[PDB]
Design a protein around this nucleic acid. Structure first.
Ligand code: K
Ligand code: K
Ligand code: K
Ligand code: K
Ligand code: K
Ligand code: K
Ligand code: K
Ligand code: K
Ligand code: K
Ligand code: K
Ligand code: K
Ligand code: K
Ligand code: K
Ligand code: K
Ligand code: K
Ligand code: K
Ligand code: K
Ligand code: K
Ligand code: K
Ligand code: K
Ligand code: K
Ligand code: K
Ligand code: K
Ligand code: K
Ligand code: K
Ligand code: K
Ligand code: K
Ligand code: K
Ligand code: K
Ligand code: K
Ligand code: MG
Ligand code: MG
Ligand code: MG
Ligand code: MG
Ligand code: MG
Ligand code: MG
Ligand code: MG
Ligand code: MG
Ligand code: MG
Ligand code: MG
Ligand code: MG
Ligand code: MG
Ligand code: MG
Ligand code: MG
Ligand code: MG
Ligand code: MG
Ligand code: MG
Ligand code: MG
Ligand code: MG
Ligand code: MG
Ligand code: MG
Ligand code: MG
Ligand code: MG
Ligand code: MG
Ligand code: MG
Ligand code: MG
Ligand code: MG
Ligand code: MG
Ligand code: MG
Ligand code: MG
Ligand code: MG
Ligand code: MG
Ligand code: MG
Ligand code: MG
Ligand code: MG
Ligand code: MG
Ligand code: MG
Ligand code: MG
Ligand code: MG
Ligand code: MG
Ligand code: MG
Ligand code: MG
Ligand code: ZN
Lengths: 125, 206, 122, 53, 114
RNA sequence: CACCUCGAUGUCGGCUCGUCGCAUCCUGGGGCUGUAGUCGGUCCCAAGGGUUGGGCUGUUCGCCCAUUAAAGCGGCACGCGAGCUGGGUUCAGAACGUCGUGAGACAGUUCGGUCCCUAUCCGUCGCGGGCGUUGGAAAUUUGAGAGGAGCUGUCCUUAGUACGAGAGGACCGGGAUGGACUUACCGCUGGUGUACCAGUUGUUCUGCCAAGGGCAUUGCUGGGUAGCUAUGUAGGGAAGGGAUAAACGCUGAAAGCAUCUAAGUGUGAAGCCCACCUCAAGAUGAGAUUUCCCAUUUCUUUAAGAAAGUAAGACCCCUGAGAGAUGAUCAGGUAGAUAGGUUGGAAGUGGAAGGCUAGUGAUAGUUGGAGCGGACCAAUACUAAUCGGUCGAGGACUUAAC
RNA sequence: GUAGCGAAAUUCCUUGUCGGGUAAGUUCCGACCCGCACGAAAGGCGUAACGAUUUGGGCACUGUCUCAACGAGAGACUCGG
RNA sequence: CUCGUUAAGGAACUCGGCAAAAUGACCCCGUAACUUCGGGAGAAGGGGUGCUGACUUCGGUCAGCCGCAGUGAAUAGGCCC
RNA sequence: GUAUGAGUAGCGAAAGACAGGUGAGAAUCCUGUCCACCGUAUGACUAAGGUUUCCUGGGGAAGGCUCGUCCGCCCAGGGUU
RNA sequence: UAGUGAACCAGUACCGUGAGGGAAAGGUGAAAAGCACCCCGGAAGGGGAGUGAAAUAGAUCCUGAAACCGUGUGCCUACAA
C-alpha cells in the first residue's frame, strides 16, 4: 500500500516530488517518519531510472523530478549549472551503479517541538 | 478423520462432464500426532495434532519438550481432534492428505477475515433509513427498545468489531487430493484469509 | 433480474408490444425473476389489431434478459434487452410467432412450444 | 445530554487511573554512555550503531 | 500462486488459437438436448478477455434476429470443441463495451490480415 | 373517577429496531363430524419458526389490484421523535361556506408555515489494563452456564392405485427442485477501485520542436490490479435419541361386570432435553492434561519475614499485516525474507519514446504484443528491524493414606 | 335568488353517483344536481399571456427505492500544544 | 457531513419525484391546441460541431484522417397534457 | 472564589516543501528555491469610518484560539510640508 | 459585600446612537532597612548570603478560614448490589 500523508491525491503527489527532489539535491534531509518512509521508495525509483540512463528513463524521471538547480560551479571561467535531473543521471546513477537497491537510509531522531512529530534523517548511503 | 492445513487460495477446476466448479486449495504438510489423550489421564479421548514446522528460534524450551515425545520439529499450530479411533494413532504418527479421498463430505473450520469496527448495517445486515425526504437517519442501529424496562435488553445488536470468528462450513466436497503436493481441493469457499489455519474433518452430519 | 414495475418487450405477435410486471410468481417474498420465470404483467402498449389488448392482466414467461443466465458448464449468456412471451396457463404462447433469439433455459422449464417457434435458441 | 450528578473526587480519580504518561526505550548509548532512545540517534554524541551521523 | 498454477496447469488447454478482443471467432460449443449431444456454432466478435491461467474467460458478441447476444466462455472449458479465428479486427482497446450501444454499420470493424 | 406529572411526562401516521402474551393466520399432533375420496366444519394440544408488494388516502382503518403455506390478534407511555420524518392535528398570514351589527368565531374547509441538546451515571455493543485463580512459566483443553439456528412451496413416484356410480381422487412411504432467511468467500458474473494504463479539450510552465508537468469535480472520457464487495459463488435449517402435551392404549381393581390408573406398563407434536453452530474456568466452585525452570544470595527471626540477583519465560523498543479507532491479535528482529528497494514475473492497459517508411497533410505501417505497470507472485540482506534494557520462581499449614 | 355556475378554496351525509385515466385512483379530470350552507362590483361566469402559486397525469432521468457496495476529503480515533 | 462511481430494475420511494439525476452553448430544419392576433415559442421533435488538404461566391462545398466520445474540459432551459 | 462535565467540545472555508540563517529555544521568524491559490480580484486607487494601527530600533509579561526569536501587541524615538 | 455609587485619580473604567445605566479596587514593616554579593536559569522564578524582633512580614506583601488542588502515610479495600 501507500500512505496518504494527510493530503489530497494531487497535493500528496506534489509534496513527494518536492521532497524527493530536495533529497536528490542535498543527499540528506530531515522530515517526519511517514514522509520519509514514503520518500524512500519514490527516490529509490528515481535512482533506478538514473541507473538505466537511456532517454526513455530520462523522460520518465523528468515527469517526477522538479526543475531545480542541483548545484552550480564556475568551470572554465564559466558558471555551470546542474539541474536535479542532470545530477541524478550524471552523478547518482553512476554512484549507485553497483548497489541492488536500498540506496537510502533513515535515522530516527528527536520529535519535533511544535508537534512532537517523530523526525528522521533520510540520506543516501 | 481430520487434518490441519493452510488456506492457500481459490481457483476453479473442470470436473468430468466438463462442469466447472470453484475450489479452495488447502495445503496440509503432514501433521504429526503430538499427544494422545484418554479417559484415564485426561477424562476424555482425543489426539493432539501439530502442523506447520516452526523455526527453532521461534519456539520455547517448554514447547520443544512437549514435541520431543513425538520427535519432530516445533509445530506452529496445535489442535485436538475428538471422535477418532485412538487405537489408530500414536505419538509421532503422521497424518497426510491421503487420509481423505475425492468425493468425501467434510466440515471445514476457519477464522473469518477480520473487518474491524463495523456499523450495524454491515455487521448485522440491518436496514438503512431513508436517504432523502428530510431523513437524518441513514446508517443508525434503530431504536434501542421500549420505554417500560428503563433499560436496553441484551442482544440489542450494535456496531462493534466484525469478523475474526470461528466459523464452520458443513458438507463441503473434497474435489481432489494431491499427496505429492499435500493439497486438498475443496469445492466452494471456506472461511479465513490466505495463509490462515484451516481444519478439515469428516462431516458430522454424514 | 426482472422485478415489479419492470417493463419488457414482447417477443411474439400476440398483440401486446410492451408489458409491465405486476408479480414475480414462485414465492411469498420473491423479489426478482430471471429467464424462464413466469410473471403477472399488464399490457402497457399493444398493436392496434392484436388479440391481446392494452390494459389487460396477463401471464408471461421471460425469454431473454440483460442480466442473462449462467450455464452449468461455466459459460454465460447475456442479451441486449428484456423480452417476454405472453402465455396461457398451460405455457402455450398466446401468439403464433416468436421474435428474436431465445435462451435455452426454457427447454428444461418445459416451454417446448415457445422453444420450437423461436427463430433461434441459445 | 448533561451530567445528572457532579462527579465525586473518588470517581474522578478512578477514571484518571489510566490517564498517565510513560517513558520507554531508554538505555545507555554505546558511544558516550548517555541514556538514549533505542533505535534512535543519540542526541548527545550524534552516534548510532557506533558511528557518527 | 505458484502452487495454484501447478495444480491447474494440467487442465489448461493447448490448442487455443492466438486471438485478441476485436477478432471475429467461431466457437464450436457443445450442447446437449437430452441424450443427444451437438455442436452449435456461435460466431461473433470477441468483446472481452479477462482473467489468468485456468480462470481466463472471453466474451463473444453477435446480433442474431436483430437482438444483441453475448456468450462468455472459460478459455479452457472442454465443452468448447474448437475456437476458430474467422477474422482479425483493428481495435484500440482491450474491452469493446462501446459496441453494445452501436448497431449495424456503426459497429463494423476493419480487418487487418495479421 | 381525578390519584403522579401544568418551576413541561411531546401528541396521530410512517421509518429503524425489535421484544413479549396466546384467546393460533400458516406449518406440527389429535378427538368428533350431518368425516366415502379431494375438500372441509368444530373442538383439543401447540408460541419453534414464518406470517407481502402495490393503487387511493396524512392517515390508522378500509376498499381495490396481484400474490402467499399464511397474509393472526394484542401488550410493551395506543413500544420506539436526547433514534429519524413531520404529511394530519394546536400559533402568527390569506381565502371559501356559515354564525355575528362588530371585533371575530367554527356548528366546517383550503393554500403556507423554525422538530434544539458535545452522553455524567445505569443500560446495550465491542476492546484493553489490574489483580486473582496460592512456586514461576508455554501450550492444549473438559464444559457449569449462555447465545445462535428452528420456516416453507411446487413437482415426480407410489397410483390414476385406496375411495367413489361418476366426476374426481388420496393417507402412509421414497425422491427432485425452489422461495424467504442465513454463515462464509472473491475462483466465476458484475460493482468499486483519487500514487494502474490509455484517449482528449482549454490554458499555462519545463527557452523552442518533440516529449512532458500544473490546474480545470480524479478536468473529462474508455478500461482496470489488490482490497472491500452482491445482485455473484458455496454451504445451512439432515437424519436421530430422551421425557412429555392433547390423544390413544395394554393389563388392572376399587365396584365379580365395566374401566387408559390407583399400583403396573406403552405409543404420541415444527413444541421441552439432547442432537447441529458459536462463546465459555473471574464456573472467586477460578477445573484438567503435556511440557519447561530449580531450590540461589543477603539481613532480619522463626517471620506464608524483607530485598536482590537471576533461571524457564514475557515485555519494552524496532520491521510489519492475514490484524487494527487506540490497546489488543498475529508475522519478524541478521539464529532474518518482517517491510522498503532491486531483479524476474503476473494482472491491467493496449502498441511507449527515438527512429525509419508511405503520404502534400492530418495520419498510418514498422522497429515491437511494445512501453508503462499501487496493493499480487517469486527470489535477493542492498536499506531498516543495531546496541540494548526491564520484569520474571526457590514454592504455607492440617490430616488421611504410603 | 334571475342569468350564470354547482360534491366547488363552498357538499356535512361523502370515498355521493356515473364516465375517463391506473392492474388497482378517498386525490385528479368530465358529467349529474336534494346547492347541509353558490350567485351577480364584500361582483357571477369565462379568459390568451404570466406564476420559485396549489393540484393530477405522461416522457426523460436517475441510489428516491428493491438493497445496498466501493472510493475521496473534513471531523471523529492516537500523539504534542 | 461534503463529494465521485454503480450490476439489473427505473418512482416500486415518499404526504409529495424532496433530493439527486437528466436538459443546457452555438448553427440548421421544424414547431401544435388556443389567442386579446402581440403571443403560445427557445413549444415539441430532430440534425451538425474535431483535425488535414483542395475549392470557394469566403458560408460553404468536396475529399481525406483520428477517437468510445469533436460547444472532447468549465460555464449555459428538462419537456408535455 | 472554586469545582463538575474534562484534559472532553472547539482551536473559525484553502498547499505547502526542504536548505540555510537567527536564536536559550523554531512546523509557526528571516532568506532562498520549487510548488500551489486569487487575478471584474484575494490586484491598483479612493470616499466614509477608524484615529497612530504608519516608519525605525528594541521586547516576549499579557493579547495572538498552538508556537513565536514574530505582530495591527508592549517599550523608545520618529513621521503628515 | 458595611458606610456616599465612589475611603483608592468615580460618576472614572465599561455599556448604549442617545437620553441613560454604572463597577471593581484600602492594610509590607517601627523604620525600606524594599534582599549588596554568589549559584541554577535566556528570563521569570528560585537556593544561599544579607536587612529585620519577625521574610511562612519580599511588595499577588498584617491576620490567612472554607470550598478546591496536591505530597507523605497509620489502617482498609479487586465475589462486591
Ligand atoms: K402538565
Ligand atoms: K380436525
Ligand atoms: K409459534
Ligand atoms: K401509500
Ligand atoms: K408487536
Ligand atoms: K424530534
Ligand atoms: K427521553
Ligand atoms: K444513574
Ligand atoms: K498541457
Ligand atoms: K499553476
Ligand atoms: K470498473
Ligand atoms: K483458571
Ligand atoms: K514508437
Ligand atoms: K503487456
Ligand atoms: K354539485
Ligand atoms: K356551501
Ligand atoms: K373509474
Ligand atoms: K396555472
Ligand atoms: K408564484
Ligand atoms: K450516490
Ligand atoms: K423498490
Ligand atoms: K398518498
Ligand atoms: K407549451
Ligand atoms: K462523430
Ligand atoms: K439555457
Ligand atoms: K468551570
Ligand atoms: K474538570
Ligand atoms: K521584534
Ligand atoms: K507576618
Ligand atoms: K490522604
Ligand atoms: Mg486536480
Ligand atoms: Mg525543494
Ligand atoms: Mg428496505
Ligand atoms: Mg428495572
Ligand atoms: Mg488479459
Ligand atoms: Mg376527591
Ligand atoms: Mg422539573
Ligand atoms: Mg392454547
Ligand atoms: Mg406511542
Ligand atoms: Mg425517546
Ligand atoms: Mg352578516
Ligand atoms: Mg369543532
Ligand atoms: Mg412555499
Ligand atoms: Mg469477485
Ligand atoms: Mg482476484
Ligand atoms: Mg509541442
Ligand atoms: Mg488558478
Ligand atoms: Mg514473502
Ligand atoms: Mg369526485
Ligand atoms: Mg402513479
Ligand atoms: Mg371511478
Ligand atoms: Mg360569496
Ligand atoms: Mg353585492
Ligand atoms: Mg374577484
Ligand atoms: Mg490532545
Ligand atoms: Mg444503477
Ligand atoms: Mg446501468
Ligand atoms: Mg407509490
Ligand atoms: Mg409504499
Ligand atoms: Mg427537485
Ligand atoms: Mg461541456
Ligand atoms: Mg465525555
Ligand atoms: Mg484557522
Ligand atoms: Mg468571475
Ligand atoms: Mg508595523
Ligand atoms: Mg518593529
Ligand atoms: Mg501563546
Ligand atoms: Mg458599590
Ligand atoms: Mg506565619
Ligand atoms: Mg499574608
Ligand atoms: Mg460468587
Ligand atoms: Mg475480597
Ligand atoms: Zn551517545
Amino acid at each position: 500500500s501507500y500512505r496518504k500523508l494527510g493530503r489530497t491525491s494531487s497535493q500528496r503527489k506534489a509534496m513527494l516530488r518536492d521532497i524527493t527532489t530536495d533529497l536528490i539535491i542535498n543527499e540528506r534531509i530531515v522530515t517526519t517518519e511517514a514522509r520519509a518512509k514514503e520518500v524512500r521508495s519514490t527516490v529509490e525509483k528515481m535512482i533506478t531510472l538514473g541507473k538505466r540512463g537511456d532517454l526513455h528513463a530520462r523522460r520518465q524521471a523528468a515527469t517526477f523530478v522538479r526543475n531545480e538547480v542541483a548545484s552550480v560551479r564556475e568551470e572554465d571561467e564559466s558558471i555551470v549549472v546542474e539541474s536535479a535531473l542532470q545530477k541524478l543521471f550524471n552523478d547518482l546513477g553512476p554512484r549507485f551503479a553497483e548497489r541492488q537497491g536500498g540506496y537510502t537510509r533513515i535515522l530516527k531522531t528527536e520529535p519535533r517541538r511544535g508537534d512532537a512529530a517523530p523526525m528522521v534523517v533520510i540520506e543516501f548511503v | 478423520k481430520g487434518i490441519l492445513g493452510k488456506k492457500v487460495g481459490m481457483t476453479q477446476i473442470f470436473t468430468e462432464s466438463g462442469e466447472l466448479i470453484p475450489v479452495t486449495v488447502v495445503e496440509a504438510t503432514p501433521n504429526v500426532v503430538l499427544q494422545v489423550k484418554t479417559v484415564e489421564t485426561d477424562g476424555y479421548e482425543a489426539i493432539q495434532v501439530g502442523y506447520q514446522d516452526k523455526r527453532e528460534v521461534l519456539s520455547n524450551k517448554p514447547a520443544k519438550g512437549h514435541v520431543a515425545k513425538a520427535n519432530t520439529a516445533p509445530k506452529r499450530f496445535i489442535k485436538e481432534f475428538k471422535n477418532v479411533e485412538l487405537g489408530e494413532y500414536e505419538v509421532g504418527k503422521e497424518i497426510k492428505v491421503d487420509v481423505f479421498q475425492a468425493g468425501d463430505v467434510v466440515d471445514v473450520t476457519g477464522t473469518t477475515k477480520g473487518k474491524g469496527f463495523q456499523g450495524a448495517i454491515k455487521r448485522h445486515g440491518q436496514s438503512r433509513g431513508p436517504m432523502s425526504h428530510g431523513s437524518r437517519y441513514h446508517r443508525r442501529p434503530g431504536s434501542m427498545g421500549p420505554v417500560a424496562p428503563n433499560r436496553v435488553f441484551k442482544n440489542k445488536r450494535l456496531a462493534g468489531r466484525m469478523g475474526g470468528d470461528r466459523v464452520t462450513i458443513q458438507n463441503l466436497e473434497v474435489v481432489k487430493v494431491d499427496v505429492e503436493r499435500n493439497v486438498i481441493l475443496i469445492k466452494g469457499n471456506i472461511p479465513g484469509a490466505k495463509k490462515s489455519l484451516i481444519t478439515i474433518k469428516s462431516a458430522v452430519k454424514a | 433480474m426482472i422485478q415489479q414495475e419492470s417493463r419488457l418487450r414482447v417477443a411474439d405477435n400476440s398483440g401486446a408490444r410492451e408489458i409491465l410486471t405486476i408479480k414475480v410468481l414462485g414465492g411469498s417474498g420473491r423479489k426478482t425473476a430471471n429467464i424462464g420465470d413466469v410473471i403477472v404483467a399488464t399490457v402497457k402498449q399493444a398493436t392496434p389489431g392484436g388479440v391481446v389488448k392494452k390494459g389487460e392482466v396477463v401471464k408471461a414467461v421471460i425469454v431473454r434478459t440483460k442480466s442473462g443466465a449462467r450455464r452449468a458448464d461455466g459459460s454465460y449468456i447475456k442479451f441486449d434487452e428484456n423480452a417476454a412471451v405472453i402465455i396461457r396457463d398451460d405455457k402455450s404462447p398466446r401468439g403464433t410467432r416468436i421474435f428474436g433469439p431465445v435462451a435455452r433455459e426454457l427447454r428444461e422449464n418445459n416451454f417446448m412450444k415457445i422453444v420450437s417457434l423461436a427463430p433461434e435458441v441459445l | 445530554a448533561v451530567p445528572a450528578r457532579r462527579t465525586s473526587k473518588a470517581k474522578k480519580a478512578k477514571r484518571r487511573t489510566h490517564y498517565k504518561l510513560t517513558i520507554k526505550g531508554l538505555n545507555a548509548c554505546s558511544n558516550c554512555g548517555e541514556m538514549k532512545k533505542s533505535h534512535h540517534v543519540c542526541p548527545a554524541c550524534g552516534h548510532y550503531d557506533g558511528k557518527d551521523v | 500462486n505458484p502452487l495454484i498454477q501447478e495444480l491447474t496447469q494440467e487442465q489448461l488447454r493447448t490448442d487455443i488459437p492466438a486471438f485478441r478482443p476485436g477478432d471475429t471467432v467461431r466457437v464450436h460449443a457443445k450442447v446437449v438436448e437430452g441424450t443427444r449431444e451437438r455442436i452449435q456454432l456461435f460466431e461473433g466478435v470477441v468483446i472481452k478477455r479477462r482473467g489468468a491461467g485456468i480462470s481466463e474467460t472471453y466474451t463473444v458478441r453477435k446480433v442474431s434476429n436483430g437482438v444483441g447476444v453475448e456468450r462468455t466462455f472459460p478459455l479452457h472449458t472442454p465443452r468448447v470443441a474448437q475456437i476458430e479465428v474467422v477474422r482479425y479486427g483493428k481495435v484500440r482497446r482491450a474491452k469493446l463495451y462501446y459496441l453494445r450501444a452501436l448497431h449495424g454499420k456503426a459497429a463494423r470493424i476493419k480487418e487487418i490480415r495479421r
